[PDB]
């Protein structure tokens, strides 16, 4: 009946959705996701949130998904949403492979999840998906890419952009420390954790806290790897040694 | 499915959502678009480069045919489906009635899709307003503008946007007989629009021109920086 | 194929022959043409093969299903309704001829079913290409309330006869005894025969085969 | 027949810890030949390889659409597919097209993802798996190779005695079919590499 | 308030409001009059016009050649229910190859009329009829409502200011049954004259009749042809 | 208020507001009365006449539903004729599909079921009708049953539907229905109509009398003119 | 009559961006009765506390520790009704792996499963979200596996973890215990005690209930063994 | 606690509680009736309180026990019509059950499907929850005779004696100290032990018409509904 519905997609008399803006709000609340594009290699770093003691930590990062083996994604948002879309993403790229047997390139795979995210906004009176989710990837046409995507369905190709929780501080940082035309994923790393530890709330930017991605091209085979708990330990340290070496300066 | 009418009359007589769809294309970044005597030319502005943006996602201006291009300013995402749905059609109206797509019938169906949308329960109206530039097999430039609602008319130069009212006015005062000719003076009475725009960065406003007997082709950066050298040379002999 | 069943006073001893025939070629040698329905019921598949293990497998899910809902071991009554109503709906395109046997709360019970949808409940029954022969033996040495042993003795002299005496049927014997307090299964319950040793080497010595073009790759 | 249209020949065999997949490399439709390189064995991952051989078409679908299940299983479930496992996905595949059979007799030869221990199986175009410790033949010319794999084949051999008799199997059991042949490539797997060789043959 | 918005929605008077103000419809609509005589019945409506340059709007329309239908309410609804009425006398004459009797026909405009005011969504039909038939049983007039309650009547009158044509149809209609084709459309007409404002009068262009019979199908009269019945009239008693 | 929107809505109390309101419709309706005679049942029916003009047997409440059963409608005609083509309709169902005449009590238990349905549902409204089946059998007897807009039905010696339903059935309980010949019981149905008719609070009304019973072989009938006429000549001379 | 009902969704984004609907039905999984579950090294141990109101109801006749399937069980806390629809269609989607894959479904795959099933009622029209949060626990390749899934569809891995009444103190008194060095399951002792913690009048055979999952599978404690274990219970 | 509509459609509300579910126990309350269940070594036994308000109903049409099948039988307490239709969906899932699986549905199962039924109702606004309550009694082999209720927010759970109604928390009572010295009641004990807790709990001292007893007995599977001198037999035994 009328009287038991939400609009959902109903234009405000503003003219932006209500519903929309509402679920970027639920994306500021998330935990902070950051990408930071290097020649060498693209990287996803995002912070693990609700780390209680008992948690067995087995899903082998529960925050990074690998769409397909040249392109992966991680997701700030409501975790229901996240599996729905992180599946479809899957299949996605599966039935272009068969279609035209060549890895999805992945503008494609951030555009066509998006075609589905505006569909929930246009039509159908059903809630809006409430999930922004980065996108790092290689593809033969275009290299090293990092994409942003909206639950609007906007997407952006951001060489560094952060969706969590600290989003306006990590960016500002980002914009000031990132340095175009220079790579070095070190240098891309070494950024992301000084970034991190300003988002994060917490001191000490502990190992567990957070988890960190990077997708690099390695004998034409493009390898996901993710950064084991003690290289993410020898990480915080450099930056702590940086840190103590601005100490020793002032 | 969902089966209620999102738009319906209100007393005044006006479809209250059909209106509040223009609001968002108010709201939506400027785009100018003018006819040339052979080239066709349309840019856009409000780039807003955050320097880690990559500017090709970003592009506002796409060719849906080789004949066809459009430009839009509104919500960004519903234009993508009006413009891939475009892309559909206008390939079909080639494997139906073989020949090329007449631009007047690729903005008649972008109209019918939109109207559609207003005519149809359950969705809300498509919230992009746009600008169809293309060449016929006659030569003729036509320059198209499809409005929410879903109306479409033919215009010889027009803009979208925020600031659309200031840029049109500007337009029309500034509107050459002879369509400024030369090609370069089309690009600059474009380009002199895009000073018009209230960002006036220069670099920040992008505009693509197509020949019209070629294909759409984007003014490579440094190119549009000395067409708008060419337009602060004009403001030089004006002073 | 031979497949063989008999009611013995505590319960249902069920056999079949283990060879699989594309054409007139012998595909397998060992192909097990005994299936778990459910922990207290088992069933012989002959027929096209894929269609006797899908149509097993679906039965045995659904029972599977009921049974964690019901609490209780499934009854035979309930393998034998799901397996005829399915296979009259397909009309005999599920080209499977199964042999059904439990033990349930009522008691031990064998069923014959078809491909066309048609079971029979009776004391023995035999189905497959050997068919005829087991019935003979079936029918000139069964005897009402047997032991166990005098029960399995009479399944493998039946499948005996079909293996010796259809070219379809052959291979080892496979036995699974049902009884309300055990289930046995001897999967090689006989081998009657024995592929004989080969009395010259035919070993080819490294070398003696010639390589166009070779390639390595490192794994892990 | 549709199986002989357009030809084909598989053979897998087991070893001492390793598994061999070979395939006659002669695609042509009825007598005359096109093309001496299809590909009959698609790696199915590290380790596991699946030949198919039928129509050439449903070669293709069958490898295509079977790498599109695994590829999803595979991120959905963290771990390699089981060599059993994957026999089952391709029972399933070959069945839900029953009533209208995919022409192809897929034979699967891996070693274990976390064990390494061989397995080899043979589908039927239906969907029947037959797992077995010897040899799978599934092609046009299945008789002569059955004939030379019982005579060949030796209970517990290293990778060099499979690679012999797996490339005698084939090559001498090629020759007497006339619509598959033109060369032969053998794919033994090992826990330490994958050899992949292609054996001088009659191209007649 | 609230229990007005649906038709689902039942008053705690339990009366439906929504078939109420369908029933209004109806009145605010061109009146019509029905009368039946022993052999013929006529179905009298008066049309009315826009604008002077303006034609008046058909009212009566025919359905089949023994039925014709009087509409006094939304047009577009009774273009709704015509056709449905055109299409059930087609496949009776098609499978019975007989006339369907009117009466039959009455039910089945009833039962379409019902399903609406019932489910949700679905609004009630907005139009008033008087349908006019002749079948073995003889002539026939029959009064549906937007209720979907169809009423058999001898005489009748739906719309605007049709009270003053019930009062006189009601007066005379003992002299209804014995009368000649005629005097029937003279008792209609006159009954009509009574709907009209005392300013206004019955004249060619505005009034419509039709009529079916024995030996008549339905004919819609109208225009010159409308002009002898309306001849030899007494002059209106103002 | 607020609970009585929807018939999916329960009230706090517990109620259905919906179906009550329903209910209040068929109060609102005229009274048709049904009694169980010893051989077969007999419905009497109030039909005050609203206009003059209409011709008669205009919005005739009793309708013959199969040939052994018919039904007294009050409530929304309109709701009734639905009602009435549901009745048909299952009765039919019954002949085809299970070769003989549907028995009365199943007939008011399918009928009843569809009553029920539209109480569930917020799109459908609850059904505005409270009409009366009743059979005559040599097999099973006579049988009499009212189904209300709720959706039960009971079986019923004597019953009454309606704003005079308190008074008919007071009047109807003195009669000594389960001895009574139907022919005789006819008059004493339309004493009690013509009692509780009101007289100035509806205007004049007709008397449509029903028959189904062993003088009508098992087949419901309208009751003949001749045997009609001299019963309201007993009520009217019954009631002075 | 009605046909499918209402297709547009009952869950909303809040201003705030938190769905209200789904933050109600986890108030239903706090008031549900106490459950917990903790995973040892051998195997996972799943408790929940069963007290019927009255002498009058049978306590045998409804278990609410299930088994999904023969190395898979479940445990709820919230709605009694909603656990059994998902207990039913858990088993479902089991058997189907089963049928496809010819193994028995991993541990993890289910509880994904289960969940999505969950998700669907969020964003699906006219449905309110399930009320009831589940325990599934499982023994998959040997290593013991606890998972939980909430009404939203959200599902965790806990070696340790209580919802129902007074959870917070059961994950406190649990935190205060398992060291997870436990190689046997002597967490059925500590289960039994986090239970006893916020238990009410007392602990019998009756009153809890209680299913271990080891690598023989997931067998429901028989109710003599139940009291075994609360016999001696430190 | 109300937020929105969460008292008006089954949506959930703050504290986590079905509002319109709970009105719909109410329902149950209702209608003026009560029942009682008891189970016993070798019989269960289900008795009602039959109230026929006018004498003209029928008094055999006014039941509220009902046969699902040959071995199983009910007791409905609620608003009738939406009894009615519970007891059709049983008995049609048990036709089915014997139909696709071979044997008679276990009084286990019969009660486990029509609470999903019901569960659906609360899960899927557009369909009311349902104000009807059924007690079902069976004799199942290795389980004895068997006494199941199912709730209309879809709860079930096997029940040695119970009962649902106006007067509940008194008889639930009543039958619990009795249970708890019950050691094993006898045919005519589980008869005397039911209707004694009714006729305290009404306080009424009925007489034989004004109730119903069905029993289904281990030497007898068949559910029989006792005729009112098998009642009075009973009644007056306990009177003595
Ligand atoms: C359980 C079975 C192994 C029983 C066994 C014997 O009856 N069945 C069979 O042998 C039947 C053929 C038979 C009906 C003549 N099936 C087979 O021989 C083979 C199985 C081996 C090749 C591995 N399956 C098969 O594909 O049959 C060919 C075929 C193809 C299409 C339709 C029908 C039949």
Excluded at chain 3, 62 to 91: C, D, I, W
């Amino acid at each position: 009946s009328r009287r038991y519905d939400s609009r959902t997609t109903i234009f405000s008399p503003e003219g932006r959705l209500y519903q929309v803006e509402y679920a970027m709000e639920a994306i500021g609340h998330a935990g902070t996701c950051l990408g930071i594009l290097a020649n060498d290699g693209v990287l996803l770093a995002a912070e693990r949130r609700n780390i209680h003691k008992l948690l067995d930590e087995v899903f082998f990062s529960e925050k990074i998904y690998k769409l397909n083996e040249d392109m992966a994604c991680s997701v700030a948002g409501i975790t229901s949403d996240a599996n729905v879309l992180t599946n479809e993403l899957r299949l996605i790229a599966q039935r272009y492979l068969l279609q035209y047997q060549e890895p999805i390139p992945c503008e494609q795979l951030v555009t066509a999840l998006c075609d589905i995210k505006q569909a929930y906004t246009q039509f159908g009176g059903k809630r809006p998906f409430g999930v922004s989710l980065l996108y790092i990837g290689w593809d033969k046409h275009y290299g090293f890419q990092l994409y942003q995507s909206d639950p609007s369905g906007n997407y952006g190709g951001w060489k560094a952009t952060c969706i969590g929780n600290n989003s306006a501080a990590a960016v500002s940082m980002l914009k000031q420390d990132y340095k175009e035309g220079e790579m070095t994923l070190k240098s891309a790393l070494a950024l992301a954790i000084k970034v991190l530890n300003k988002t994060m709330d917490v001191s000490k930017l502990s190992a567990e806290k957070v988890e960190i991605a990077t997708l690099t091209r390695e004998n034409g085979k493009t390898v996901i790897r993710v950064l084991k708990q003690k290289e993410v330990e020898q990480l915080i340290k450099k930056h702590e040694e940086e840190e103590a070496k601005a100490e020793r300066e002032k | 499915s969902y089966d209620r009418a999102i738009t319906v009359f209100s007393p005044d007589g006006h479809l209250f959502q059909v209106e509040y769809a223009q609001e968002a294309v108010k709201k939506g970044s400027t785009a100018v678009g003018v006819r040339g005597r052979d080239i066709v030319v349309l840019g856009v502005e409000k780039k807003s480069v955050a320097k880690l943006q990559d500017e090709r996602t970003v592009r506002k201006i796409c060719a849906l045919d080789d004949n066809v291009c459009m430009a839009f300013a509104g919500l960004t995402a519903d234009a993508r489906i009006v413009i891939n749905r475009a892309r559909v059609e206008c390939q079909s109206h080639r494997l139906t009635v073989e020949d090329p797509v007449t631009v007047e019938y690729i903005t008649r169906y972008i109209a019918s899709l939109k109207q559609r949308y207003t005519q149809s329960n359950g969705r809300r109206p498509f919230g992009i307003s746009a600008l169809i530039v293309g060449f016929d097999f006659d030569g003729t430039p036509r320059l198209y503008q499809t409005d929410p609602s879903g109306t479409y008319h033919a215009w010889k130069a027009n803009a979208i946007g925020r600031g659309a009212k200031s840029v049109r006015e500007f337009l029309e005062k500034n509107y050459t007989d002879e369509a400024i000719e030369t090609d370069d003076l089309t690009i600059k009475l474009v380009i002199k629009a895009l000073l018009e725009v209230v960002q006036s960065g220069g670099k920040n406003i992008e505009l693509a021109v197509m020949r019209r007997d070629q294909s759409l082709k984007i003014l490579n950066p440094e190119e549009i920086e000395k067409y708008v050298a060419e337009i602060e040379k004009e403001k030089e002999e004006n002073e | 194929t031979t497949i063989a069943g008999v009611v013995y006073k505590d319960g249902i001893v069920l056999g079949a022959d283990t060879r699989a025939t594309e054409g007139m070629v012998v595909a397998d040698k060992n192909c097990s043409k005994i299936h778990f329905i459910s922990p207290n019921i088992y069933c012989c598949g002959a027929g096209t093969a894929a269609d006797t293990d899908m149509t097993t497998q679906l039965i045995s899910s659904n029972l599977e299903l009921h049974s964690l809902s019901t609490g209780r071991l499934p009854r035979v009554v309930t393998a034998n309704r799901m397996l005829k109503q399915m296979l009259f709906r397909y009309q005999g395109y599920i080209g499977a001829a199964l042999v059904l046997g439990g033990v349930d709360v009522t008691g031990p019970h064998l069923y014959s079913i078809y491909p066309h949808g048609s079971t029979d409940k009776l004391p023995y029954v035999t189905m497959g290409s050997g068919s005829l022969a087991a019935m003979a033996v079936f029918e000139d040495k069964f005897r009402p309330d047997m032991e166990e042993e005098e029960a399995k003795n009479l399944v493998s002299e039946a499948i005996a006869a079909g293996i010796f005496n259809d070219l379809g049927s052959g291979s080892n014997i496979d036995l699974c005894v049902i009884s309300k307090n055990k289930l046995d299964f001897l999967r090689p319950y006989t081998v009657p025969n024995k592929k004989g040793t080969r009395l010259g080497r035919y070993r080819c010595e490294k070398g003696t085969t010639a390589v166009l073009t070779e390639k390595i790759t490192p794994l892990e | 027949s549709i199986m002989s249209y357009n030809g084909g020949a598989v053979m897998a065999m087991k070893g001492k810890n390793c598994v061999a997949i070979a395939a006659d490399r002669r695609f042509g439709i009825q007598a005359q030949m096109v093309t001496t390189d299809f590909q009959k064995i698609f790696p199915m991952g590290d380790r596991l390889y699946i030949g198919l051989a039928g129509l050439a078409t449903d070669v293709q679908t069958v490898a295509q659409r079977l790498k599109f299940r695994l590829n999803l299983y595979e991120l959905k479930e963290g771990r390699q597919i089981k060599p059993y496992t994957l026999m089952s996905m391709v029972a399933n595949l070959l069945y839900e097209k029953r009533f209208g059979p995919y022409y192809t007799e897929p034979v699967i030869a891996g070693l274990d993802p976390k064990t390494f221990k061989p397995f080899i199986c043979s589908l039927d175009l239906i969907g029947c798996p037959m797992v077995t410790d010897d040899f799978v033949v599934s092609g046009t010319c299945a008789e002569q190779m059955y004939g030379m794999c019982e005579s060949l084949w030796e209970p517990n051999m290293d990778p060099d005695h499979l690679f012999e008799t797996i490339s005698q199997a084939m090559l001498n059991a090629v020759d007497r079919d006339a619509v598959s042949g033109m060369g032969v490539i053998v794919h033994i797997i090992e826990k330490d590499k994958i050899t992949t060789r292609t054996l001088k043959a009659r191209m007649d | 308030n609230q229990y007005d918005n649906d038709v689902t929605v039942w008053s705690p008077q339990g009366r439906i409001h929504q078939i109420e103000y369908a029933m209004e419809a109806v009145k605010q609509g061109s009146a019509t009059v029905g009368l039946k005589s022993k052999t013929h019945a006529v179905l009298v409506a008066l049309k009315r016009a826009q604008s002077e340059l303006a034609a008046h709007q058909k009212k009566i329309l025919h359905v089949d050649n023994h039925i014709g239908i009087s509409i006094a309410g939304l047009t577009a609804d009774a273009r709704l229910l015509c056709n449905f009425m055109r299409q059930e006398c087609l496949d009776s004459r098609f499978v019975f190859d007989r006339p369907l009797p009117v009466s039959r026909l009455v039910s089945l405009i009833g039962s379409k009329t019902q399903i609406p005011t019932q489910r949700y969504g679905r609004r009630p039909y907005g139009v008033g009829l008087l349908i006019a038939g002749y079948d073995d049983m003889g002539p026939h007039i029959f009064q549906t409502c937007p209720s979907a309650n169809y009423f058999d009547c001898r005489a009748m009158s739906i719309g605007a200011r049709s009270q003053s044509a019930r009062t006189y149809l009601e007066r005379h209609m003992s002299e209804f049954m014995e009368c000649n084709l005629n005097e029937l459309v003279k008792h209609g007409l006159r009954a009509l004259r009574e709907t009209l404002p005392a300013e206004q009068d019955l004249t060619t262009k505005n009034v419509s009749i039709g009529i079916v019979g024995k030996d008549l199908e339905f004919t819609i009269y109208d225009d010159d042809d409308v002009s002898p019945f309306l001849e030899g009239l007494e002059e209106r008693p103002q | 208020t607020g609970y009585d929107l929807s018939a999916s809505t329960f009230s706090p109390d517990g109620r259905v507001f919906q179906v009550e309101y329903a209910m209040k419709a068929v109060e609102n309706s005229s009274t048709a009365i049904g009694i169980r005679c010893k051989d077969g049942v007999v419905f009497g029916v109030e039909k005050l006449v609203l206009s003059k003009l209409y011709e008669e047997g205009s919005n005739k409440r009793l309708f013959n539903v199969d040939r052994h059963v018919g039904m007294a409608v009050a409530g929304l005609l309109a709701d009734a004729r639905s009602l009435a083509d549901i009745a048909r309709e299952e009765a039919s169902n019954f002949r085809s599909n299970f070769g003989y005449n549907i028995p009365l009590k199943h007939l008011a238990d399918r009928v009843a079921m569809y009553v029920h349905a539209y109480t569930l549902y917020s799109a459908v409204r609850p059904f505005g009708c409270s009409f009366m089946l009743g059979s005559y059998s040599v097999n099973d007897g006579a049988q009499l049953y009212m189904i209300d807009p709720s959706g039960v039905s009971y079986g019923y010696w004597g019953c009454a539907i309606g704003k005079a339903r308190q008074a008919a059935k007071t009047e109807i309980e003195k009669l000594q229905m389960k001895e009574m010949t139907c022919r005789d019981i006819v008059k004493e149905v339309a004493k009690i109509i013509y009692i509780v008719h009101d007289e100035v609070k509806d205007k004049a009304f007709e008397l449509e009398l029903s028959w189904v019973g062993e003088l009508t072989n098992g087949r419901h009938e309208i009751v003949p003119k001749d045997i009609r006429e001299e019963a309201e000549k007993y009520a009217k001379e019954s009631l002075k | 009559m009605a046909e499918r009902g209402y297709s547009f969704s009952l869950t909303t984004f809040s201003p705030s961006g938190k769905l209200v609907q789904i933050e109600y039905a986890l108030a239903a999984v706090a008031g549900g009765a106490p459950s917990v579950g903790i995973k040892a090294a051998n195997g996972v141990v799943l408790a929940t506390e069963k007290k019927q109101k009255s002498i009058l109801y049978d306590e045998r006749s409804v278990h609410k520790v299930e088994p999904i399937t023969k190395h898979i069980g479940l445990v709820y806390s919230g709605m009694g009704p909603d656990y059994r629809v998902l207990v039913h269609r858990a088993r479902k989607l089991a058997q189907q792996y089963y049928l496809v894959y010819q193994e028995p479904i991993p541990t993890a795959q289910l509880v994904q499963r289960v969940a999505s099933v969950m998700q669907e009622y969020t964003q699906s029209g006219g449905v309110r979200p399930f009320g009831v949060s589940l325990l599934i626990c499982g023994w998959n390749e040997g290593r013991p596996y606890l998972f939980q899934s909430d009404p939203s569809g959200a599902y965790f891995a806990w070696k340790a973890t209580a919802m129902g009444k007074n959870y917070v103190n059961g994950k406190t008194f649990l935190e205060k215990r398992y060291n997870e060095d436990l190689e046997l399951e002597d967490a059925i002792h500590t289960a039994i005690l986090t239970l006893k913690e916020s238990f009410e009048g007392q602990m019998t055979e009756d009153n809890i209930e209680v299913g271990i999952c080891n690598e023989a599978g997931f067998r429901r404690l028989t109710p003599t063994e139940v009291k075994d274990y609360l016999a001696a219970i430190a | 606690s109300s937020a929105g509509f969460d008292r008006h459609i089954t949506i959930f509300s703050p504290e986590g509680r079905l509002y319109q579910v709970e009105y719909a126990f109410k329902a149950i309350n209702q209608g003026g009736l009560t029942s009682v269940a008891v189970r016993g070594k070798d019989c269960a036994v289900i008795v009602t309180q039959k109230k026929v308000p006018d004498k003209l109903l029928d008094s055999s049409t006014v039941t509220h026990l009902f046969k699902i099948t040959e071995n199983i039988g009910c007791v409905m307490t609620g608003m009738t019509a939406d009894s009615r239709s519970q007891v059709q969906r049983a008995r049609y899932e048990a036709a089915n059950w014997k139909y696709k699986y071979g044997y008679e549905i276990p009084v286990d199962m019969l009660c486990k499907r029509i609470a999903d039924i019901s569960q659906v109702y609360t899960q899927n606004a557009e369909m009311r929850p349902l104000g009807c309550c059924m007690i079902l009694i069976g004799i199942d082999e290795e389980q004895g005779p068997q006494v199941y209720k199912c709730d209309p927010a879809g709860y079930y759970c096997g029940f040695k004696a119970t009962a649902a109604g106006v007067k509940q928390t008194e008889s639930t009572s009543f039958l619990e100290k009795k249970v708890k010295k019950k050691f094993d009641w006898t045919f005519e004990q589980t008869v005397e032990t039911a209707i004694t807790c009714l006729s305290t709990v009404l306080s009424i001292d009925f007489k034989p018409s004004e109730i119903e007893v069905g029993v289904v007995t281990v030497e007898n599977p068949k559910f029989r509904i006792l005729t009112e001198a098998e009642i009075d037999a009973h009644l007056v035994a306990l009177a003595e």
